[PDB]
Write a protein that binds this ligand. Structure first.
Ligand SMILES: Cc1cc2nc3c(=O)[nH]c(=O)nc-3n(C[C@H](O)[C@H](O)[C@H](O)COP(=O)(O)OP(=O)(O)OC[C@H]3O[C@@H](n4cnc5c(N)ncnc54)[C@H](O)[C@@H]3O)c2cc1C
Length: 491
């Protein structure tokens, strides 16, 4: 290995690369690599290829839950040291997106957002909720948030990547050049190569955002309205659709206090009808607009667009704050988080896609019964449109329906809870997964984590052969991101 950066063994370095946000694994590698670029990364890969047991896993921000970015006794590539390696904007006359910003696979989304807006007036159009995540990390899964119904997830918003494959080759790919690789890497859980650069689409950045949260007590009403809103003609309705499932109680972390947006308007439960479940549903909406716009004009447009929603009057919270605060709103929960001690404890989260034909059986038992007291955080569930997603990528979504729902229990661990707590949480996630498999629920996990081949073959379904062909082509010794646990390293 010939590297310009600094390698670290043991101590705090190995310690950190041995932990993640989920807090359930501490797998130590032989070393941590700091690549000053693609060659240092290819060096790491090739060392593993000649070696007897070393593997190779790129790390982004560590946000993962189950150790997918770890390499027991192998190499971890600290992509963090390649973050500022790219920032080149170009225009697209091809209609659709305006420009692009070739950015490093190691760049963080929040920093990208700031620089892009604080010097150019352009922004990517498809995001994730949390921005303290890397470009390569989210592009290796899908990158989903509230703009995906309109623009697809982040993997649908890249037009070129530089990748260091499991063969050690440093390559640039797109739909045209080295295409099978391009599509393999997108959503491919780090299995076919490390993403050092991505060509991320940019649209003109909006000025402002009207942030809305309204409340429903009836699911099929909340779900019918949500589907109706995301099914509207492009740019005729909102620019953000979200929402969750909170408990029908005062629990400041699981209940109605988690709904309002600003401190001067709180949730008055005396507006809820007597015949509502132990849980209510919030619909979360975001409308983009320019600061030159007259408030009376904007107010009239919002009423127009919300005029056909069946929520409950008197339980529709809203605020108008700048596009950038609206996008870093997750920093608001990261704060309460640290203030309450759980931002630091284990997070045995649950994330999944449950197609429309099956989301119904989910609110029935899961939300209203299994986790009716909440999981100590948000419980999202917004609809999406399969049409926006390209089946050429390595991504995996439900088998049937032009509309599927993204799911995700944002489980936290109160500082009090015994360690037995995290076991019951994991156990309950496994149970939900069991309940879905046993009832033939067409669900698939997002950020999937399985420990057996038979679970991975089922998850990939008819695309398992393709996932195997791509592996045999781009990482035949199976040295890449072995922590995903889909393929075992070569003997
Ligand atoms: C509270 C909370 C909220 C969340 N909200 C969202 C959300 O709104 N949207 C969303 O999409 N996700 C969300 N997630 C999941 C989260 O996005 C991921 O764990 C996180 O983005 C991982 O990102 P990372 O950048 O740290 O990379 P990693 O955790 O390191 O994960 C990416 C996988 O890719 C590999 N990898 C890392 N960098 C590269 C690279 N450059 N090239 C190739 N492979 C690489 C890793 O080894 C790993 O196997 C949330 C998680 C939590 C705990």
């Amino acid at each position: 290995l010939n590297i310009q950066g600094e390698i670290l063994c043991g101590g705090a370095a190995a310690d950190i690369a041995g932990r993640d946000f989920g807090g359930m694994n501490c797998v130590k590698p032989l070393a941590v690599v700091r690549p000053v670029g693609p060659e240092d990364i290819a060096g790491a890969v090739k060392a593993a290829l000649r070696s007897d047991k070393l593997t190779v896993a790129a790390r982004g921000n560590g946000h993962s839950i189950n150790g997918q970015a770890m390499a027991e006794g192998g190499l971890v590539v600290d992509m963090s040291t390649t973050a500022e390696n790219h920032f080149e904007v170009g225009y697209l006359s091809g209609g659709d997106a305006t420009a692009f910003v070739d950015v490093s696979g190691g760049a963080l989304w929040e920093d990208v957002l700031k620089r892009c807006v604080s010097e150019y007036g352009l922004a990517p159009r498809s995001w994730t909720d949390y921005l303290g995540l890397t470009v390569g990390g989210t592009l290796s899964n899908a990158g989903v948030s509230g703009q995906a119904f309109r623009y697809g997830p982040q993997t649908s918003n890249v037009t070129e990547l530089d990748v260091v494959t499991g063969n050690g080759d440093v390559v640039t790919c797109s739909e045209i050049e080295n295409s099978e690789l391009f599509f393999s890497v997108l959503g491919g859980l780090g299995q076919f190569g490390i993403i050092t650069r991505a060509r991320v689409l940019l649209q003109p950045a909006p000025d402002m955002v009207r942030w809305i949260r309204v409340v429903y007590t009836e699911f099929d009403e909340f779900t019918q309205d949500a589907e109706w809103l995301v099914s509207q003609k492009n740019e005729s309705s909102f620019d953000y659709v979200e929402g969750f499932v909170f408990v029908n109680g005062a629990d400041p972390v699981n209940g109605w206090p988690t709904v309002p947006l600003h401190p001067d308007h709180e949730f008055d439960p005396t507006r809820l009808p007597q015949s509502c479940g132990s849980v209510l549903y919030c619909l979360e909406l975001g409308l983009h607009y320019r600061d030159s716009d007259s408030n009376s004009t904007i107010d009239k447009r919002v009423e127009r667009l919300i005029g056909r929603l069946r929520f409950n009057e008197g339980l529709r919270f809203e605020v108008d704050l700048p596009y950038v605060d609206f996008l870093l709103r997750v920093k608001r929960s990261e704060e309460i988080a640290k203030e309450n001690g759980t931002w630091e404890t284990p997070h045995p989260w649950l994330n999944l896609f449950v197609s429309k034909r099956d989301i119904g059986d989910f609110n029935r038992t899961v939300f209203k019964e299994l986790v009716k007291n909440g999981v100590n955080g948000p419980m999202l569930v917004y609809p999406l449109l399969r049409s926006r997603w390209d089946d050429r990528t390595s991504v995996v979504i439900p088998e049937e329906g032009e509309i599927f729902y993204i799911v995700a229990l944002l489980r936290f661990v109160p500082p009090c809870a015994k360690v037995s707590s995290v076991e019951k949480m994991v156990a309950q996630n496994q149970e939900i997964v069991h309940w879905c498999v046993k009832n033939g629920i067409d669900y698939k996990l997002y950020l999937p984590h399985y420990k057996s081949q038979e679970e991975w073959i089922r998850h990939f379904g008819n695309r398992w052969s393709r996932f195997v062909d791509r592996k045999a082509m781009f990482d035949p010794m199976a040295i890449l991101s072995p922590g995903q646990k889909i393929f075992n390293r070569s003997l």
